[PDB]
Amino acid sequence: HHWGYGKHNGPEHWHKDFPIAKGERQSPVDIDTHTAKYDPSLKPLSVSYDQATSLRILNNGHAFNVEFDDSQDKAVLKGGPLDGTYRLIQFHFHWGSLDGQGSEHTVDKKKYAAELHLVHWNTKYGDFGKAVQQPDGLAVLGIFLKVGSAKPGLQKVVDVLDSIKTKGKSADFTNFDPRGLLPESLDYWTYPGSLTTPPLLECVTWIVLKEPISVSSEQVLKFRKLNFNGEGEPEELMVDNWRPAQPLKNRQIKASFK
Numbered sequence: 001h002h003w004g005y006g007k008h009n010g011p012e013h014w015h016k017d018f019p020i021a022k023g024e025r026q027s028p029v030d031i032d033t034h035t036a037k038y039d040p041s042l043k044p045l046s047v048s049y050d051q052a053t054s055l056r057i058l059n060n061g062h063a064f065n066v067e068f069d070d071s072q073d074k075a076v077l078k079g080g081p082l083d084g085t086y087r088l089i090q091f092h093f094h095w096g097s098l099d100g101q102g103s104e105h106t107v108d109k110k111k112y113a114a115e116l117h118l119v120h121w122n123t124k125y126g127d128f129g130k131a132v133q134q135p136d137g138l139a140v141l142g143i144f145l146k147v148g149s150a151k152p153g154l155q156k157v158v159d160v161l162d163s164i165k166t167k168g169k170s171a172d173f174t175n176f177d178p179r180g181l182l183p184e185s186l187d188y189w190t191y192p193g194s195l196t197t198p199p200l201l202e203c204v205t206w207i208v209l210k211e212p213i214s215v216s217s218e219q220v221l222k223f224r225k226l227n228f229n230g231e232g233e234p235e236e237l238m239v240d241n242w243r244p245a246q247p248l249k250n251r252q253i254k255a256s257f258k
């Protein structure tokens, strides 16, 4: 009986195996747009993904990750509230069983159909494993997805899901350009938080974009066809793999815009 999102191993049970679940800087949180502070000292984000090298896509049992080669500064995030260079290692999504839920972060209590997380780690720490043990170890770019028009840049991802239907399956996934997943504007909210899945370490600097991207009902429907289970085990659709909002606990959310 390990963690999951079902009735018996869901987010509400995680604190038993991971006490930090009830910690002081847990994520996600609800972003109250009228309480967030405009901080003009925040620089614009600098996303250099031109030399990104995707390597494979994997179904790990709780979501699907697209992994990148992070052995060099090929795809990096700088600027904003960050000190130093953060390398992109993987990206994944959080989605629901219905279009009205799925995102982890909420804006004025509004839930989106899904949320994309682009995970980066601070290079001063040498590797992802060391970075997660530091308060400024990770930088995660969060992007909301709403249902409407199709996103062409996401179709390549949608088309291969069939080959990694169950837990443990992986497939080569080269030459995917993550720049096709970015919205027009890079305005954002930022606050110090944690990973939203166990081990739930409080090593993340969250950068949540104001502008969501649109995907079609057909694209999100294919996400819902994935399984939490491994091949040959009873089928459990991979849906609602999101953690609900946690207490802000006197943290302050800053906005790069007004």
Ligand SMILES: [Zn+2]
Residues within 6 Å of the ligand: 092, 093, 094, 117, 196
């Ligand atoms: Zn995530």
